[PDB]
Ligand binder design. Structure first.
Ligand SMILES: [Zn+2]
Ligand SMILES: [Zn+2]
Ligand SMILES: [Zn+2]
Lengths: 63, 108, 287, 45, 59
């Protein structure tokens, strides 16, 4: 539903990086450059943000 | 219920047992330890000169318990070699801590 | 009266809060591995362990919220001085009590017609020493729309990463062997320079490079090597055997330490050394 | 005080007998049991 | 844990009740998994993190 607090494999805090990643995507960045500018170096941490599905917005409408 | 981690039962933390087939040979059984203590104690005993066998083993990889086997020469005994290894490891850790504190104070 | 002691040597190359890089030499790989294993699984921190929920009107269930709250890093400099809750006799758990427990509270309710975020900046402790770590907006917990509400009370305790990964202070601690690279220059002259470019282009990272100012090759940054056999398999594929050679330089390592911020990156190494001393002392023989 | 809500409008009925299962202000036949006030404890694990 | 209780009725005079129970599971030692290429299997061991073999970045 929401972004997980930590990466599954290593345990780095990523839970305060979703809206920043969406803001960088909205200003016409590639996904690799949006993750480079945000500090993620290991590919385990990058696949947490490239592959997240944000289901909380759909859950908020349908009650 | 998540409490049986580092606490042993009414057993000893370390139990000594001097085997009968080979002389100057013993097996120390340590409760609530794993690869961390066993590997450095093993590789410190190999640095000793009156140690002919040193080896550690988990009896089962899902148990938190190790067994350490030492065979010495006649110039020493297994218990002396065990205690000498442990004291050398403490003095090495103290030297390391002093070096690290000096470097951290240097970097600021 | 015998001594068989080692003397490790430390040289820090970059140090800041939450990050440390340092090279360590003249000890064994068993000691470097002991420091790594203890820093991942033995150094204690403080994290939320009990959650008591009064109102939950959000679209998320209670185990989701409790598992999210368990993984938020708190400031834990007191964790070496406080005691586990299995050892404390001055209380019953179940509330705020020094040496074993911290109480947190949270309450939120949306009244606007916009969606309200509930972050980790809404958790208020009854102890001003143990707070959430400051990094932004804060870590998201839940979102509310209108007329929904979250209200709870938490109990944060002390533990280690061997028990649950929420108590681990290391997002990633690792080391690597330091390499020793020799290039036989008497066989390096035998190669024309496009074959030298063909050799250098086989390496995945930037370990070798080509200086045409002397029309030769040079090993620059010999720590970007990753111990794959690609350049050696390339030189064995050209037939020119023994042109390069790489051996791991024994008793020399490079540590990299990152912390979640609960504790500093120097304090993690120092607490690892203290705990490893404390378990070397409790194993002794009395005799 | 066990009370029910209507899943269509939201009127808070109070059923204590076993006559029928029906709302008043709608006429529809679906009701939910309301969550009263109590504390439930969880591990954060 | 009780999630909801729903009470319904019919048009020909019949009452229904439904109670829902919520459970939360992490994988245990005989749960079943498969890739996207038909390689199914069962979980046979859960290993600690510091016992796993690691790369030069710590993955
Ligand atoms: Zn990661
Ligand atoms: Zn207490
Ligand atoms: Zn109605």
């Amino acid at each position: 539903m929401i972004i997980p607090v930590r990466c599954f494999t290593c345990g780095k805090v990523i839970g305060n990086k979703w809206d920043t990643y969406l803001d960088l995507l909205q200003a016409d960045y590639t996904e690799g450059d949006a993750l480079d500018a945000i500090g993620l170096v290991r590919y385990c941490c990058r696949r947490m943000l490239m592959t997240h599905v944000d289901l909380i917005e759909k859950l908020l409408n349908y009650n | 219920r998540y409490e049986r981690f580092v606490v042993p039962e009414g057993t000893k933390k370390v139990s000594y047992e001097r085997d009968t087939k080979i002389i100057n040979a013993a097996s120390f059984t340590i409760e609530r330890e794993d690869h961390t203590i066993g590997n450095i104690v093993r590789m410190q005993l190999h640095r000793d000169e009156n140690v002919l066998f040193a080896g550690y083993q988990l009896p089962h990889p899902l148990k938190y318990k190790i067994i350490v086997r030492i065979h010495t020469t006649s110039q020493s005994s297994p218990m002396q070699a065990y205690n000498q290894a442990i004291n050398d490891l403490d003095k090495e850790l103290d030297f390391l801590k002093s070096q690290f504190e000096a470097e951290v104070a240097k970097f600021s | 009266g015998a001594t068989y002691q080692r003397f490790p040597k430390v040289k820090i190359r970059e140090l800041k809060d939450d990050y440390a890089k340092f090279e360590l030499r003249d000890t064994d790989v068993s000691m470097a591995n002991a420091l790594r294993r203890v820093m991942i699984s033995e150094v204690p921190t403080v994290a939320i362990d009990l959650v008591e929920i009064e109102v939950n009107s959000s679209v998320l269930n209670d185990e989701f919220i409790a598992h999210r709250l368990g993984l938020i890093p708190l400031t834990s400099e007191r964790a070496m001085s406080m005691r586990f809750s299995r050892d404390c006799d001055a209380c019953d758990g179940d509330g705020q009590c020094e040496f074993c427990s911290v109480e947190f509270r949270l309450s939120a309710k949306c009244v606007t017609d916009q969606t309200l975020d509930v972050t980790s900046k809404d958790l208020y402790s009854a102890d001003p020493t143990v707070t959430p770590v400051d990094f932004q907006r804060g870590i998201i917990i839940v979102k509310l729309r209108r007329g929904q509400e979250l209200k709870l009370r938490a109990i944060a305790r002390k533990g280690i990463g061997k028990d649950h990964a929420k108590w681990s202070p290391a997002a990633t601690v690792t080391f690597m062997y330091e390499p020793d690279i020799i290039i036989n220059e008497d066989m390096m002259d035998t190669l024309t320079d496009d074959e030298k470019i063909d050799l250098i282009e086989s390496s995945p990272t930037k370990v070798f490079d080509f200086d045409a100012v002397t029309r030769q090759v040079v090993v620059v940054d010999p720590e970007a090597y990753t111990y794959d056999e690609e350049v050696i398999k390339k030189a064995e594929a050209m037939g020119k055997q023994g042109l390069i050679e790489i051996r791991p330089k024994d008793d020399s390592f490079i540590f990299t330490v990152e912390s979640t911020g609960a504790v500093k990156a120097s304090q993690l190494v120092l607490n690892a050394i203290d705990l490893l001393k404390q378990k070397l002392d409790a194993v002794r023989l009395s005799d | 005080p066990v009370t029910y809500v209507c899943g269509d409008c939201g009127q808070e009925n109070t059923l204590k007998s076993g006559d029928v299962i029906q709302c008043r202000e709608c006429g529809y036949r679906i009701l939910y049991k309301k969550r009263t006030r109590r504390v439930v404890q969880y591990e954060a694990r | 844990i009780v999630q909801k209780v729903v009470l319904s009725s019919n048009d020909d005079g019949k009452n229904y009740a439904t109670v829902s129970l919520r459970q939360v599971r992490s994988p245990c030692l005989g749960d079943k998994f498969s890739s996207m290429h038909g390689q199914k299997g069962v979980l046979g061991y859960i290993e600690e993190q510091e016992n796993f073999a690691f790369t030069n970045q710590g993955i």
